Design an enzyme around this catalytic site. Sequence first.
Site, short mmCIF file in Angstrom:
data_model
loop_
_atom_site.label_atom_id
_atom_site.label_comp_id
_atom_site.label_asym_id
_atom_site.label_seq_id
_atom_site.Cartn_x
_atom_site.Cartn_y
_atom_site.Cartn_z
N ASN A 36 0.88 -1.17 0.00
CA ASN A 36 0.00 0.00 0.00
C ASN A 36 0.92 1.22 0.00
OD1 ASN A 36 -1.72 2.19 0.74
ND2 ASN A 36 -3.06 0.87 1.97
N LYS A 74 3.22 1.54 3.19
CA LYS A 74 2.48 1.63 4.45
C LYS A 74 3.06 0.68 5.49
CE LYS A 74 -2.32 1.97 6.03
NZ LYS A 74 -3.72 1.77 5.52
N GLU A 100 -7.53 -5.43 4.78
CA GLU A 100 -6.29 -4.89 4.24
C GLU A 100 -5.09 -5.75 4.61
OE1 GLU A 100 -3.85 -0.68 4.45
OE2 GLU A 100 -6.03 -0.56 4.53
N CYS A 127 -2.99 6.77 5.83
CA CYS A 127 -4.19 6.39 6.57
C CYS A 127 -3.91 6.25 8.06
CB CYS A 127 -4.79 5.09 6.01
SG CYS A 127 -6.54 4.85 6.45
N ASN A 175 -8.35 6.33 3.80
CA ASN A 175 -9.68 5.75 3.68
C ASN A 175 -10.08 5.27 5.07
OD1 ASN A 175 -10.41 5.28 0.58
ND2 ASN A 175 -8.19 5.02 0.89
#
Lengths: 304, 311
Positions: free
Chosen positions: A109, A126, A145, A171, A196
Amino acid sequence: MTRRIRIGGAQMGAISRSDSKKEIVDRLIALLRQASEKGCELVVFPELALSTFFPRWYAERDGMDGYFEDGMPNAATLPLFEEARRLGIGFSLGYAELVQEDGRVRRFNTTVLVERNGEIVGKYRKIHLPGHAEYEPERSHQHLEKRYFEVGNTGFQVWDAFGGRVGMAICNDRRWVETYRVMGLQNVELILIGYNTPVNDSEAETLGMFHNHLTMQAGAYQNSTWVVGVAKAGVEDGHRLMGGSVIVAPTGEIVAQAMTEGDELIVADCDLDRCRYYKSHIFNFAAHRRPEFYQRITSQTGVE
Amino acid sequence: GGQQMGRGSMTRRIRIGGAQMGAISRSDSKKEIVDRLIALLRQASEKGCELVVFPELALSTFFPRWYAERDGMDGYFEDGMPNAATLPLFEEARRLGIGFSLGYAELVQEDGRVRRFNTTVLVERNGEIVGKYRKIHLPGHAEYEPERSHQHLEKRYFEVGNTGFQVWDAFGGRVGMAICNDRRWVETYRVMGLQNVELILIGYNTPVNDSLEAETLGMFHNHLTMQAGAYQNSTWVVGVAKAGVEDGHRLMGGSVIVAPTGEIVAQAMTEGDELIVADCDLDRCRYYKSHIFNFAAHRRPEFYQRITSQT
């Protein structure tokens, strides 16, 4: 005007599974054009800005590769890179990265930061993966995720870009004090965060929004840095995503805030020398760090 | 909240009095100071508090604003804890069955020399001292700096504490302490969150520069750091000021009690001696320790090395 940059936060509305990728990219360009017309020199896009938030759907661990980006840029995204360079605008873009590293295929990500000249400054992968590895029947919506991405291997990097020191997070990184501290210890002046955030229906929505701003405002003030937080918001296939995109000054003040849950541009003039100001003064008052008392932060993972 | 905010007594619910103080001037007697803390303790007892949080350095004027020899402020330090002047406070607390945290300037013979600490002590309902925290982050400067509107000489009269941020089994849960500008450092809260802290007690003296403003920004920052530290470590936080105008120098008010959600549940309205009270369900700390802030499930220390390899 020595180290000032006009920044546009390009909040996005819902992306459904039924949207064409061509029309997604078109929406990014339209926001990038509005940012140009408003004099922006940097545009921040959300996490995973090139697809629906597919972590909400159950599939094989490799059954989601169809949402991922082959390269960056690739054929689908090259129109955006070319518009940005033609307009002289830099941007950060979140996407799902599919890559061949050490023989095997890896899934990250990722956000990529692109400078006014169209060159890739850098790439953040991420670190803190939210959600769960397996279907959760007691949840109203899935968040899987963890099932589809690996933990990133870039670290929290800070780059020489846009006349200052620029870092990225993604995020739910933004709820960990460590995320901002790691970059403040590298003299960060601008942190870019797309997100998100699922909203749980029925309130506690206001508390979610409070926590969204609280964590970014504290990260900004406590590390004397600008923080840009950009949402992909709205209702994707029955699933609400949080809005509340903001630009936050090193004072911790919100200086721009979105008012819709759709495609929306927020703008602020961000003086990076204001970050230097609060970081240290010739006659200053802030004690110095005492890391000999901080070892638990790296010596344990959870509580004692 | 637009409702009655108190809640009845209950297992693992602790009623906390935040005992904000007004100004202490250089000309105040020690008895006058102690009697003022005893008055707040009795106020807290009549409201049914089981724990009362007093400010940083609650037993003297904020003497770091003044310049003296490096051992010239020792007369503001406590000889022992308790001593002849502070024993009536412990006797009141023990008799009423109320614990408390108390900030003071600690003068101690240890390691062969004289050491000076900016200290808070946590006293249980039974009268027993159960823990001691010595301030880690000393603000200000060490020598007289005449270009400054006001002096802040804490580094001159105190040494760096040698306790670390400890968390104790106390008051039916996990209690930690910090002092004043510790509360600006995310490491302060996190180090105790890693010890499963449920209640952090912070007294403070925050000078305010002569304004007119940005006075509202100083208040915003005061509350921002405690609210975030509370939410991001899923812990209660109590911040208690000594406030008002001490000998022409203004000190910030705004004492609060903050829930592990980061919401303020009680706030001072004056800059004098004032009691704020809130009922604190320590089990509410599992609200975010279960998932959102489950440290074992989510933290990635291999990416945080700069925080402990740093300045």
